[PDB]
């Protein structure tokens, strides 16, 4: 019990505070299990819109949306599923998503033909660097940490040079340039 719960709490919080970017629909799937866990099977009597504080069931970037109807619907989808069997599922849904176990940063990429930068999620692990869609969350690109030649940072930018001719560099708008530079560095020197 105690071990299963450490992981559940870990996965949960990393989602509620937005450390693990997930797409709406899933946040509500999670919330669904979160209700099964904290309340027990659904009760179409008590469990109706307004019966929940959505600030402690979802990523700040969805509390607004008001998908309280989505959560109870997913809640309902758990029948009489145990508090434990739900914790499990939630932890398997948390791992099945690529964004799982990555350390993102919000970056602003300049896309050709449009002066208007398009917010993006930058992901980094001890093995790769991925490009993740701000809203949808679906990765768009992926690079091996071992193909990183050098990086650079400034109080308002970050750039990664793989040494890939055609593509060139990957520069972005960021205030976290010195932290994203620190991470990678730590990782790289662990991986020869």
């Amino acid at each position: 019990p105690v071990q299963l719960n450490l992981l559940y709490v870990q996965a949960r919080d990393d989602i509620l505070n937005g450390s693990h970017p997930v797409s709406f629909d899933k946040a509500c799937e999670f919330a669904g299990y979160q209700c099964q866990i904290q309340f027990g099977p659904h009760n179409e009597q008590k469990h109706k819109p307004g019966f929940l504080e959505l600030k402690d069931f979802l990523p700040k970037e969805y509390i607004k949306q008001k998908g309280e109807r989505k959560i109870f619907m997913a809640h309902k989808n758990c029948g009489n599923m145990s508090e434990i069997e739900a914790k499990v599922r939630y932890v398997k849904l948390a791992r099945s998503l690529k964004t799982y176990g990555v350390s993102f940063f919000l970056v602003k990429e300049k896309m050709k033909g449009k002066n208007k930068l398009v917010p993006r999620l930058l992901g980094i692990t001890k093995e790769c660097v991925m490009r993740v869609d701000e809203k949808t969350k679906e990765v768009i690109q992926e690079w091996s940490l071992t193909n990183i030649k050098r990086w650079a940072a400034s109080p308002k930018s970050f750039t990664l040079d793989f040494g890939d001719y055609q593509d060139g560099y990957y520069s972005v708008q960021t205030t976290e340039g010195e932290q994203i530079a620190q991470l990678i560095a730590g990782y790289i020197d662990i991986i020869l």
Partner: peptide, 13 residues
């Protein structure tokens, strides 16, 4: 402003 990985793919090894 560069910080290289001194990665064997590039650095002369």
């Amino acid at each position: 402003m560069w910080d290289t990985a001194n990665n064997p793919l590039y650095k002369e090894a």
